[PDB]
Copies of this chain bind each other. A is one copy, B any other.
Amino acid sequence: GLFAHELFYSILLFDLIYREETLFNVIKSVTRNGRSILLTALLALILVYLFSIVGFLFLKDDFILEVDRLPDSTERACDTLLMCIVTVMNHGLRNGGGVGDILRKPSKDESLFPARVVYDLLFFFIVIIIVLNLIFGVIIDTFADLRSE
């Protein structure tokens, strides 16, 4: 911080955890069973991979994402499986509804409307409602375990 660059002093703010015991105890809830949280994240990634495979196989066209170009306003985000997986992981997990939020809005007359509805609901229930909340459940359980000990 003194010599290379002034902004390097930002890392020093982490000393609050060392100084305060309460904050360290709070973080211990996350760290005690961090392996379980990481494995839950891996399971979420596997489910995202399977959902992306299904979408690429059957729902490729629906993956149209808007883009703002620095100096067309839409792009295809499921032309390749890697791109489709990246799109799902980045957007569906960060969106409350799920992947259906970014996915194109389907019309009723379209024959694939029931399939899209099932896809969106299954993603929302399996990943957003169940898997993503398992990490918070693990943290809550760790809190109680630490308190009891």
Q: Which residues of A contact B (CB under 8 A)?
A: 7, 10-11, 13-14, 16-17, 20, 22-23, 25-27, 29-30, 33, 35-36, 39-43, 46, 49-50, 53, 57, 61, 65-70, 75, 77, 83, 86, 89-91, 93-98, 100-101, 104-108, 110, 117, 120-121, 124-125, 129-130, 132-141, 143-145, 147
The 6 closest A-B pairs by CB, nearest first: A94-B97, A23-B39, A141-B143, A13-B46, A67-B107, A67-B105
Nearest CB of chain B from residue A136's CB, rounded to whole Å: 5
Assuming A69-B107, A86-B117, what are 8 further A-B pairs, CB within 8 angstroms? A16-B46, A22-B33, A22-B39, A23-B39, A77-B108, A90-B120, A93-B124, A136-B136
